[PDB]
């Protein structure tokens, strides 16, 4: 997250932190995700398609820092990794960029809700927020595109939704962005999501309800002028999410 503010897991309790174990035993951060139900985390298929072995992933809920054990956190393995069968990647755009991770503790349990671990609600069909709505993102991604290290402390920022018509303008993304994707960005281009934030939530308050409106997917650069962050539109995928859970 470029710009924005430092925060802690009690203010984003649906956020999941997903790491990968390498041969040799080092572990490194991969992507964010969101808790949708005690045993199901939803993220982005591009985060996993090149390393599709479910046994390699570690998922934490309740965790506020990259490298330390936050009180109250919970650690998990992945019982079932489900990637979308029509996922694909062009030069910029990613398609059907959505995945499901069924989670279990070493005793075989799903997440236990608490003050620092909670679900986020899914959207309803054909009801997303209007353009111009402010929504939040969260993640452990890069603070600047030239950094190679990720921030030790969890970050968040707020961005505004952009219409399909504006996002398809030729200096934005043209016909590369489709009606299954949603654009969002800062009007002054000073804060944004970035590499390391993929898979994480775009949460919008709609009609009084905090809602998982999008999943961090792709973008040209980070915080660049006329280059919005682009997000999977979760409401289109409601029949796929129910059928696979
Ligand atoms: N400008 C953004 N909001 C944005 C969003 C997601 C991003 C993801 C990657 C990324 O590296 N994606 C990726 C990694 C591995 C395989 C495929 C894509 C890079 C820049 C981003 C910018």
Contact criterion met (CB below 8 Å) for 213 and 189:
no
- Mapping DSSP to helix (H, G, I), strand (E, B) and coil, where does residue 200 land? coil
What would be the CATH architecture of the domain defined by 13-119+236-245?
Answer: Beta Barrel (2.40)
Domain boundary assignment for the chain: 1-12+120-235, 13-119+236-245
Cβ–ligand 1 contact at 229 (below 6 Å): yes
Cα 89 to averaged position of ligand 1 atoms, centre (Å):
12
Q: Count Cα neighbours of 201 within 13 Å in the Cβ-side half-sphere.
A: 29
Class of domain 1-12+120-235: mainly beta
The token pair at 245 is 């859970």
Q: Is 207 helix (H, G, I), strand (E, B) or coil?
A: coil
Got the DSSP string for 19-79? EEEPTTS-EEEEEEEEEEETTEEEE-GGGTTTS--GGGEEEEES--BTTS--TT-EEEEEE
Computed from CA positions of residues 165, 167, 173, 177, in that sequence, does the dihedral angle turn out positive or negative?
negative
Q: What is the spatial distance between Cα 63 and Cα 55, in angstroms, rounded to a whole number?
A: 21
193 Cβ inside 6 Å of ligand 1: yes
Catalytic annotation, residues? 46, 97, 198
- Atom 16, ligand 1: residue with shortest CA distance: 46
112 CA to middle of ligand 1, Å?
A: 31
Quick one: which atom of ligand 1 is closest to the CA of 49?
Answer: 16
**Domain 1-12+120-235 and domain 13-119+236-245 have a common topology:** yes
185 in contact with ligand 1, CB cutoff 6 A: no
- How far apart CA 99 and CA 105 sit, in angstroms, is 20
Ligand 1 centre distance from Cα of residue 47 (Å) = 9
Any ligand 1 atom below 6 A from CB of 195:
yes
Q: What angle do CA 100, 223, 4 make, to 5 degrees?
A: 80
Using a 6 Å cutoff on CB, does residue 233 contact ligand 1?
A: no
Give the residue whose CA is nearest to atom 19 of ligand 1. Answer: 195
Quick one: resolution in A? 1.6
């Amino acid at each position: 997250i470029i710009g924005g503010e430092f925060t802690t897991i009690e203010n984003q309790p649906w956020f999941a932190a997903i790491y990968r174990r390498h041969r040799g035993g080092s572990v490194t951060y991969v992507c964010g995700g969101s808790l949708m139900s005690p045993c199901w985390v939803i993220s982005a298929t591009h985060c996993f398609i090149d390393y599709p072995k479910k046994e390699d992933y570690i998922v934490y809920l309740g965790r506020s820092r990259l490298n330390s054990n936050t009180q109250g956190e919970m650690k998990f393995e992945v019982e079932n990794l489900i990637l979308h069968k029509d996922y694909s990647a062009d030069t910029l755009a990613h398609h059907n960029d959505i995945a499901l991770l069924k989670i279990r503790s070493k005793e075989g349990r799903c997440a236990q809700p608490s003050r620092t671990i909670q679900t986020i609600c899914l959207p309803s069909m054909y009801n997303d927020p209007q353009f111009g709505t402010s929504c939040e993102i969260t993640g452990f991604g890069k603070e600047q595109s030239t950094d190679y290290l990720y921030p030790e402390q969890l970050k968040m920022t707020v961005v505004k939704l952009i219409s399909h018509r504006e996002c398809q303008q030729p200096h934005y993304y043209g016909s590369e962005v489709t009606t299954k994707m949603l654009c969002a960005a800062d009007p002054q281009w000073k804060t944004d999501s970035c590499q390391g934030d993929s898979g994480g939530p775009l949460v919008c308050s709609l009609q009084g309800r905090m809602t998982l409106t999008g999943i961090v997917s792709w973008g040209r650069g980070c915080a660049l002028k006329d280059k919005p962050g682009v997000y999977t539109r979760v409401s289109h995928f409601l029949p796929w999410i129910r059928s696979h859970t």
